[PDB]
C-alpha cells in the first residue's frame, strides 16, 4: 500500500546502515532534505554498535519523499543504505 | 515467504500484574499491548501496518540471532511469578518458546543452557527496541 503519515510527521525506515555509523552520519545525510524531528538509530543490545536500521522523521510528506528518492541507494561509510516509508496504509 | 512473530511477557510483581505483548503478522500488521505501568489504570493498545522493509529487517534480526536453532526444553519453565512466550514462523521454520522471566547474569550462567538463554534475552531486547521505536514515534506516545 501507500505511505501512512504518523501522528505529527512522516517516518522513513532506513536499513543496511554501517554498524559503526552514529547519529552524526544519519544527520549529515538527511538534514539537507528537511528538518528532522526525530532519529532513532538503535544500538544492538549486546554490542553497543548501531543495529543496522533507523527511523527518521520529517515534518512533511514533501521532505520525507525528497529524502527517500535522494537517499535510497546512497552510501554511508561505503555501505549502501535503503530508504523506505516506515508505515503503510493497508494489509498485504 | 510465510512470516509471524509474537512475544508476550507477563508477571505478578510486588506492585501487581504487568504484561506486554506484540505481534507482527504476514500482512505487515503490528499489534501492540502494554500494560506495564501499574501506577495507572489505563493500558496501551495500538496497531499499525508497517512497510515491508520493516518486516524484512525483523527477519534479518531474527536470522542473525540464530534463535531459530534454539530449543526451550532445557530452559526454566514459566512459573507463578513470570512468563515469556516467543513464537516465530519464517518460511518453513517455526519455533515456540515459553519460559520464566529472564533472571540475572548469575542465573543464566548457571542454567542448563546459558548460551541459548543469552541468545533469547538479547533477541527479545532487540525486538523490544524496534517495537518501542515504532509505536513511540508513530503514535507520539510513551510505549512504556
Ligand atoms: Sr496500567
Curated annotation (Swiss-Prot), chain A:
GO CC terms in record: catalytic step 2 spliceosome; cytoplasm; exon-exon junction complex; NLS-dependent protein nuclear import complex; nucleus
Subcellular localization: Nucleus; Cytoplasm
Disruption phenotype: Developing photoreceptor cell clusters express reduced levels of rolled/MAPK and fail to differentiate normally.
Transport among keywords: yes
Miscellaneous remark of the record: 'Tsunagi' means 'connection' or 'link' in Japanese.
Family, as annotated: Belongs to the RBM8A family.
Subunit structure as annotated in this protein's UniProt entry: Heterodimer (via RRM domain) with mago. Part of the mRNA splicing-dependent exon junction complex (EJC) complex; the core complex contains btz/CASC3, eIF4AIII, mago and tsu/RBM8A. Interacts with Pym (via N-terminus); the interaction is direct. Interacts with eIF4AIII.
Protein name per its UniProtKB record: RNA-binding protein 8A
UniProt organism field: Drosophila melanogaster (Fruit fly)
Parent-protein residues present: 64 to 155 of 165
UniProtKB/Swiss-Prot annotation, chain B:
Annotated consequence of substituting residue 16 to R: In allele mago-1; zygotic lethal
GO MF, any single term: RNA binding
Keyword annotations: Cytoplasm, Developmental protein, mRNA processing, mRNA splicing, mRNA transport, Nucleus, RNA-binding, Transport
Pfam families: Mago_nashi (PF02792)
One cellular component term from this protein's GO annotations in UniProt: pole plasm
Top-level taxon of origin: Eukaryota
Localization (cell): Nucleus; Cytoplasm
Example GO BP: microtubule cytoskeleton organization
Family according to the record: Belongs to the mago nashi family.
Role summary: Core component of the splicing-dependent multiprotein exon junction complex (EJC) deposited at splice junctions on mRNAs. Involved in exon definition of genes containing long introns, including the rolled/MAPK gene. The mago-tsu heterodimer interacts with the EJC key regulator Pym leading to EJC disassembly in the cytoplasm. Has a role in oskar mRNA localization to the posterior pole of the developing oocyte, and may also be involved in polarization of the oocyte microtubule cytoskeleton.
Name assigned to this protein: Protein mago nashi
Species, as recorded: Drosophila melanogaster
Top-level taxonomy: Eukaryota, Metazoa, Ecdysozoa, Arthropoda, Hexapoda
Amino acid at each position: 500500500p501507500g505511505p501512512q503519515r504518523s501522528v505529527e510527521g512522516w517516518i522513513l525506515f532506513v536499513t543496511s546502515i554501517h554498524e559503526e555509523a552514529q547519529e552524526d552520519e544519519i544527520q549529515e545525510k538527511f538534514c539537507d532534505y528537511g528538518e528532522i524531528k526525530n532519529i532513532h538509530l538503535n544500538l544492538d543490545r549486546r554490542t553497543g554498535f548501531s543495529k543496522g536500521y533507523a527511523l527518521v522523521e520529517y515534518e512533511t510528506h514533501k521532505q520525507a519523499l525528497a529524502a527517500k528518492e535522494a537517499l535510497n541507494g546512497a552510501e554511508i561509510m561505503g555501505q549502501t543504505i535503503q530508504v523506505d516509508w516506515c508505515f503503510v496504509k493497508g494489509p498485504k | 515467504e510465510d512470516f509471524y512473530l509474537r512475544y508476550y511477557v507477563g508477571h505478578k510483581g510486588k506492585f501487581g500484574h504487568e504484561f506486554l505483548e506484540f505481534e507482527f503478522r504476514p500482512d505487515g500488521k503490528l499489534r501492540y499491548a502494554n500494560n506495564s505501568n501499574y501506577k495507572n489504570d489505563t493500558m496501551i493498545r495500538k496497531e499499525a501496518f508497517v512497510h515491508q522493509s520493516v518486516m524484512e529487517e525483523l527477519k534479518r534480526i531474527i536470522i542473525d540471532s540464530e534463535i531459530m536453532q534454539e530449543d526451550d526444553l532445557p530452559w526454566p519453565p514459566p512459573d507463578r511469578v513470570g512468563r515469556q512466550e516467543l513464537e516465530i514462523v519464517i518460511g518453513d521454520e517455526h519455533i515456540s518458546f515459553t519460559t520464566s522471566k529472564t533472571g540475572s547474569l548469575v542465573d543464566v550462567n548457571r542454567s542448563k543452557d546459558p548460551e541459548g538463554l543469552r541468545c533469547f534475552y538479547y533477541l527479545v531486547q532487540d525486538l523490544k527496541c524496534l517495537v518501542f521505536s515504532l509505536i513511540g514515534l508513530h503514535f507520539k506516545i510513551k510505549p512504556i
